[PDB]
Amino acid sequence: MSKFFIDRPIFAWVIALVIMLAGGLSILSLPVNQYPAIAPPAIAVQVSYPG
Amino acid sequence: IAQVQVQNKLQLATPLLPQEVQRQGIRVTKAVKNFLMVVGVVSTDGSMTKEDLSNYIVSNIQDPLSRTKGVGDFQVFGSQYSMRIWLDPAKLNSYQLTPGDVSSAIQAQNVQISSGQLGGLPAVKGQQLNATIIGKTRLQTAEQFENILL
Amino acid sequence: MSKFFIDRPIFAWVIALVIMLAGGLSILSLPVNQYPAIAPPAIAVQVSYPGASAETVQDTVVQVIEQQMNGIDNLRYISSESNSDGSMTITVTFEQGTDPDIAQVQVQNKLQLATPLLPQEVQRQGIRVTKAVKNFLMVVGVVSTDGSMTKEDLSNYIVSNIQDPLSRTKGVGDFQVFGSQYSMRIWLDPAKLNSYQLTPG
Amino acid sequence: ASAETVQDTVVQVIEQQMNGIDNLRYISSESNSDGSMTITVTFEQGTDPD
Amino acid sequence: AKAIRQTIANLEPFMPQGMKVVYPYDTTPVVSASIHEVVKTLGEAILLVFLVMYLFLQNFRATLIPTIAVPVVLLGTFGVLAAFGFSINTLTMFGMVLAIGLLVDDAIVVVENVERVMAEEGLSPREAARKSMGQIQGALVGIAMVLSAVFLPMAFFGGSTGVIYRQFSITIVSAMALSVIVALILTPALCATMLKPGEHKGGFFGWFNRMFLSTTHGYERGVASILKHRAPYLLIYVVIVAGMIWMFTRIPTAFLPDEDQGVLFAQVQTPPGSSAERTQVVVDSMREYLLEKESSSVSSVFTVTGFNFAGRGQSSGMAFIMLKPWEERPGGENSVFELAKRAQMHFFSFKDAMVFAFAPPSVLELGNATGFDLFLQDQAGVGHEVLLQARNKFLMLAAQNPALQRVRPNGMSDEPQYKLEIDDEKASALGVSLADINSTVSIAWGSSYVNDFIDRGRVKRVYLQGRPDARMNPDDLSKWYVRNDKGEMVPFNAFATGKWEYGSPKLERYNGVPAMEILGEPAPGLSSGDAMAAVEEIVKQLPKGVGYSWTGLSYEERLSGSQAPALYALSLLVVFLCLAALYESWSIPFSVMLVVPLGVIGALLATSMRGLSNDVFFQVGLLTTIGLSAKNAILIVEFAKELHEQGKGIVEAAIEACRMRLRPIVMTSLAFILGVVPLAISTGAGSGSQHAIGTGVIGGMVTATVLAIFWVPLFYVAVSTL
């Protein structure tokens, strides 16, 4: 699969930096947080009964 | 859809609950265990007290940041102001009164009644005057709850 | 391999018109409209508290409801409005691409705990929560030809016979009649209500 | 209650107010002799029942 | 609308006598007429391209190959946009009309290639088809990558603009990919079946082809003045690029052009504190004007009193005006905008009421009028009257501002309201309890609700209110008597006086704090950013304690920003990358990357002198213009460099490539001209959309093709040799 690309290096470079370009556009839109949704979903039904 | 299923089964739960639990209304909220950030105000000059700070938070900070993104459920360390009436049992004995009588009188004074409208439809032929009659309004300051007559 | 796909011309005819046939089925299975989902999903909470003022409707219903619109996910801005004849609306507007039925579930859940704090008349008028967009789609308007029926006759006919089968159809989310149904009005004459030592109570 | 008591105080109120629910096919209702009530709202196919 | 008409069809046999159901207001026939108009213009575009190819080439069985390759790619585009779940609207149909040329070019390329090899060797189709597939098989996936790189990265944006450009992007890229695979699998296997291996025809059409060859030879000896004058034209090129950069400031930017709808609204609002008689008089005179004076463009006037879109009351009205359909009002003087302008000057002649006549926007779902809106709110609790004074200051300073136009309160002003003051201690000292006073007031004026009652098979309600003759003026608030605690009767004159005060009838709130609205629209020439900035200068002169906040479409267009420079930068970068992919070198594809301003100059000039602003359709037209001009220039540069690397000089291979390529380039250019013409000059429903997306494309492509076909080999030689 490389024998196409030893004869043609520029197309290999342009595949490489198209991947770099899509990744650089992906860096500037991902949310940066500490941990993923590890916690289970919980529902807290609550009411103040009087006195 | 988990909240949907929880308050689907809660609807079947509510008829066997007491009348008062039904008249009050119970609420369903997605629970988050940790606290992200505590936002609090202090008093630098020592002038305004603790309940003043809780009043200012619930009146003017809780509302403008609970609509924004990310801020879900929360918990206020304190509560807002309230026109708190302190009855006095000696002076209730002095006048042959009852706390039920004070309660009925205060439910009679600050009513916001729908007091109608001048020239409201259907109008007699030849009417040219229109004005929204404001009747009594519910009272606002301490000197206006102070003059409720029993 | 190669010669199984190159040598057969009507194999290509079949692939091209299977693409055409799937296109024809997909034409007759798509909607037709004018522009895609541009506007964000709104939701309106409206009730008509009769004989009131602007301040009365506001400080008895509107503030009591919108002090409990806290802790709703994907909310952009809440904007309410209270008129003078006694009717009002809270127009909650969510973010674009949110799910409108879970949205209506959350808004109804957060106003069912402000509903018992309302006046009794505001509760007995019937609080409506609809998810529909701001424009008027179409006006269905009935007209008497001979002239033997007045405005409120035609309005009664709409509310009593057109409104109830039309509000349940596939697509209609919010309606508004220009008028009212019949309601057996009782007009208190205060001279005769004075004559017998009686009150409106 | 009677049949027409339940029909005039419960069934017809809930039918007048239940307008505009998603994927609604037909609603049917009946008022019984011993005071009960049954409205069987039938949604169309593929509706997720929650 | 179909289900509503079916429900009224199931409810119509049970009408009473003389009960007709009419439809005064309806915004569905504009949608039906718009989709019928765009599918009709698609039909005549296909018919005109077929007619041009059949009259100019005079051979039926080679024209049959692209005119059967167009419905395959069309129906495939339908199926692919149906796979993601997107609806047939004006937007995807504009995508199909703009993709007609980009799908017809490839079929023209492969048909002319087999015609050329048929004229060269005339041998067996197998190995020659292998060779011709070897040339064009790389070229079609190359132009697929090129046009994907130039058009697809507008899909990765958010907002209303993001949804519109992802509709256009996946429509054009879907028609592109279907055109590539359909051409590759079908058009050699369709041109290789039933043809003849035409030449030397008699009479007039063959002599016309000789005249076309003579104009080609005149091109061949007219390009000598280009090739000898190798120095001068680069300064003219820099002049054109500098004119483009100057021209991007001239044409104002918008969102989407204000279309015709057949719908006009009128907002009646008397001097408030008025009754229903004055509003009914103004409403009936408006109806008489619109029915006897302007019946040539107004069908039916459905006037509602009490429900304008500002608020509600007794002193408001609104006329839902339905204009006649577009076959009864031809000509630019009977549009909804000219009817609005000719009605507004007469509505100024109504000296009684303040009547404002406005037309709804293009997208009805966004709002209910045109232009911007903002909610002037407070934060500290400065006071309702101070906020009303600040709103009046905002309105007068914006009406004196030459960057705005017809700013509105969208609300009601302060009017008299009767505050009766119950003398509390005197009333309770005379004996009457205060709950009886409140019950008497609320039931006698506020129209109380007691219980229900059934009638004729339906439970309705019972109300309870005083007479229409005992609440009409402050002298008749003394007719009501309230019972004492011992059976006596106490009037309201004993314990209730009256003071007229001040207040607004429509109170507004926004994010839990009081507010007032301001509606309006920018100047007829200025952009939306200039109206934004002008509001940003008016708000700075407000008192301390209030604050602006934007609403609706204004919230998006003020908070999101503009990612169009990032759009053009990323799109041109990655299409340069796919050109260096197609050419395997770095300095060569600048001779196509440089061509872009010479493409977009025609779109800029054509939308300048026609008065068509910048919107989403103008940018889609620029992208398709850039794509088709680059798609012509790359075939020029690719086949020229291929004939250079086959063993010949630069300029000679360039000249034989461009002379062999002039007939398909000008042929598909004129075919795309004839495609995009019948929507750029059309008259009907959906006018301004078709005018913008036709005018930009026609101007840009008409200058781009027949100027790049002169100048692309020029700086091709200037960047390959030097």
Side-chain angles (χ1 to χ4, degrees), chain E residues 211-279:
Chain E
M211 192 271 174
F212 177 75
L213 186 65
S214 297
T215 59
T216 304
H217 293 170
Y219 179 81
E220 191 178 5
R221 293 183 291 172
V223 294
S225 180
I226 288 95
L227 266 297
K228 290 183 263 74
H229 289 170
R230 187 175 61 86
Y233 294 95
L234 274 69
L235 188 63
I236 291 97
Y237 196 91
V238 173
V239 162
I240 298 298
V241 176
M244 190 273 284
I245 298 171
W246 187 269
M247 194 66 72
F248 272 169
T249 62
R250 182 60 179 264
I251 294 170
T253 65
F255 182 75
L256 192 65
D258 196 356
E259 296 177 355
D260 194 1
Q261 293 292 322
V263 166
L264 185 67
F265 296 103
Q267 180 178 357
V268 181
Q269 193 169 2
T270 59
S274 294
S275 180
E277 289 291 328
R278 302 177 70 185
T279 303

Side-chain angles (χ1 to χ4, degrees), chain E residues 322-338:
Chain E
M322 180 180 282
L323 283 76
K324 285 185 182 292
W326 296 275
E327 67 268 13
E328 287 87 5
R329 50 178 179 89
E333 66 270 17
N334 283 320
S335 66
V336 72
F337 300 104
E338 291 293 326

Side-chain angles (χ1 to χ4, degrees), chain E residues 390-430:
Chain E
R391 198 267 305 275
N392 286 116
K393 183 185 287 185
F394 191 87
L395 290 179
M396 64 180 181
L397 269 66
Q400 291 176 356
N401 195 356
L404 280 311
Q405 183 182 2
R406 61 185 187 176
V407 290
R408 291 174 287 169
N410 200 6
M412 296 178 184
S413 62
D414 52 348
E415 289 304 322
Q417 61 187 0
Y418 191 78
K419 181 176 175 65
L420 55 88
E421 182 176 359
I422 300 296
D423 194 359
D424 198 2
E425 184 175 358
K426 182 177 170 64
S428 188
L430 266 61

Side-chain angles (χ1 to χ4, degrees), chain A residues 16-32:
Chain A
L17 69 96
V18 160
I19 294 169
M20 289 176 69
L21 192 149
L25 295 177
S26 174
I27 285 295
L28 300 174
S29 67
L30 287 174
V32 177

Side-chain angles (χ1 to χ4, degrees), chain E residues 8-92:
Chain E
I8 299 166
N10 292 120
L11 291 172
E12 61 88 21
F14 294 146
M15 293 292 114
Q17 186 63 255
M19 191 76 82
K20 279 176 91 286
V21 174
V22 299
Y23 299 96
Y25 175 72
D26 196 1
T27 63
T28 58
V30 60
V31 182
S32 71
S34 179
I35 55 95
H36 181 71
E37 187 68 30
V38 295
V39 71
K40 185 183 287 185
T41 54
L42 174 64
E44 57 246 10
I46 297 169
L47 183 63
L48 288 176
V49 171
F50 169 72
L51 192 276
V52 167
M53 292 186 290
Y54 183 70
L55 190 144
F56 279 167
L57 273 76
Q58 290 89 17
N59 196 1
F60 188 80
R61 310 188 84 178
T63 305
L64 190 146
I65 304 165
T67 54
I68 202 166
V70 51
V72 178
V73 178
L74 261 288
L75 275 296
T77 301
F78 280 105
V80 169
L81 67 90
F84 287 169
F86 287 170
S87 65
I88 302 302
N89 44 4
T90 67
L91 216 63
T92 62

Side-chain angles (χ1 to χ4, degrees), chain E residues 625-645:
Chain E
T625 300
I626 291 165
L628 187 62
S629 177
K631 181 170 170 61
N632 298 318
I634 60 98
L635 292 172
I636 295 295
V637 173
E638 181 179 2
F639 209 81
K641 191 267 295 296
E642 196 272 330
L643 295 174
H644 173 68
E645 70 181 0

Side-chain angles (χ1 to χ4, degrees), chain C residues 141-150 153-154 157, chain E residues 11-22:
Chain C
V142 73
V143 173
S144 68
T145 60
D146 54 355
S148 65
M149 290 178 285
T150 183
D153 276 326
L154 274 69
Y157 187 75
Chain E
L11 291 172
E12 61 88 21
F14 294 146
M15 293 292 114
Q17 186 63 255
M19 191 76 82
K20 279 176 91 286
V21 174
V22 299

